[PDB]
Amino acid sequence: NALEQYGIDLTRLAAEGKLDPVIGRDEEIRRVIQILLRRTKNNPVLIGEPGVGKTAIVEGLAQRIVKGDVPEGLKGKRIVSLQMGSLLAGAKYRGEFEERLKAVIQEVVQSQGEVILFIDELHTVVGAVDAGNMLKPALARGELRLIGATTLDEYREIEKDPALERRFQPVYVDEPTVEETISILRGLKEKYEVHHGVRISDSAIIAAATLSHRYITERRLPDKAIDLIDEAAARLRMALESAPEEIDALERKKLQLEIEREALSQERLKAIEAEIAKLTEEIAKLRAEWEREREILRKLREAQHRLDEVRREIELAERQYDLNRAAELRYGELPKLEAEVEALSEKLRGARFVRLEVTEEDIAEIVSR
Ligand SMILES: Nc1ncnc2c1ncn2[C@@H]1O[C@H](COP(=O)(O)OP(=O)(O)O)[C@@H](O)[C@H]1O
Ligand SMILES: [Cl-]
Structure with a gap:
């Protein structure tokens, strides 16, 4: 064929x-x-x-x-x-x-x-x-x-x-x-959130439209605005996979004290040996806390994917005029999954290491390059 x-x-x-x-x-x-x-x-x-x-x-x-x-x-x-x-x-x-x-x-x-x-x-x-x-x-x-x-x-x-x-x-x-592009981005937002396993603020969307229009003249809306959001979401996803900077800062500080101990005066040794142990202990605590946050992020991501399928099932039922099925999902599974997604998102707003949402700051940074 x-x-x-x-x-x-x-x-x-x-x-x-x-x-x-x-x-x-x-x-x-x-x-x-x-x-x-x-x-x-x-x-x-x-x-x-x-x-x-x-x-x-x-x-x-x-x-x-x-x-x-x-x-x-x-x-x-x-x-x-x-x-x-x-x-x-x-x-x-x-x-x-x-x-x-x-x-x-x-x-x-x-x-x-x-x-x-x-x-x-x-x-x-x-x-x-x-x-x-x-x-x-x-x-x-x-x-x-x-x-x-x-x-x-x-x-x-x-x-x-x-x-x-x-x-x-x-x-x-x-x-x-720019206005129509913002509307296009708002309409496409969930696809990008679900794919990258992150959330995208409205102000990031406004910024992608506005800054791409203003500064990236050699390309066209809405493509360049979508591309900015996509890249910002991919980079936040990648950053979420890597060790957080705060745990990373302690880890490098420990290494300096480990290199400094190779040089060594007895009082200076005992003070840094005690400091290496404290940093080891601190890293242990924050890593466990990070694993916790990571597992809330996993649950949020599962909830996002389910929500996305339920919307497709609703759309499909509506087109087929299977009105029972559409209502079964719209008044049952849909508001349940929507509340789970919102509640887990809110939980991550007070997170030490997981920053869940793409910001206008993220967009501005890509646009500078
Ligand atoms: N009205 C629209 N609604 C949703 N997405 C759009 C709309 N217009 C363009 N896009 C998206 O913007 C990007 C560029 O559109 P595309 O159709 O590939 O442009 P062209 O075919 O003119 O090069 C694609 O990701 C497309 O899905
Ligand atoms: Cl029409």
């Missing part, structure tokens, strides 16, 4: 609730639906800078299809994202790539309008690695629909081809504002 070998089925991933939430972009999703439902030039091409959210728009659409929140003409449709890496992989001889892509196109044509092909980085497929000829007839006859994604400066070149400009409909995707 060429479609599965060389594509990822975004509607299947949406049905299994495996795509991240898509926040806003309602206007852009409606526009794509509207174009797909025309008889001619019904192949929308998302045009916008890298990281702006073109792929997320297509994923939002797959979600709407699977829920059935689409007009009649799009009910039951699949969106398959073409995988250029899979097509090129092990294609050593001329004719292999071309044969693979024709198998994919043939399967799309065979589906009789039920499969819509999403082609990210469209310019890499049509233009000077050249496969425009293989798609053109199917487009012309209306037997194949596609969604494209590309940048403006590269669409300028695709547009020069007169056959394609009548088939494709440009959709210009602007970068979200």
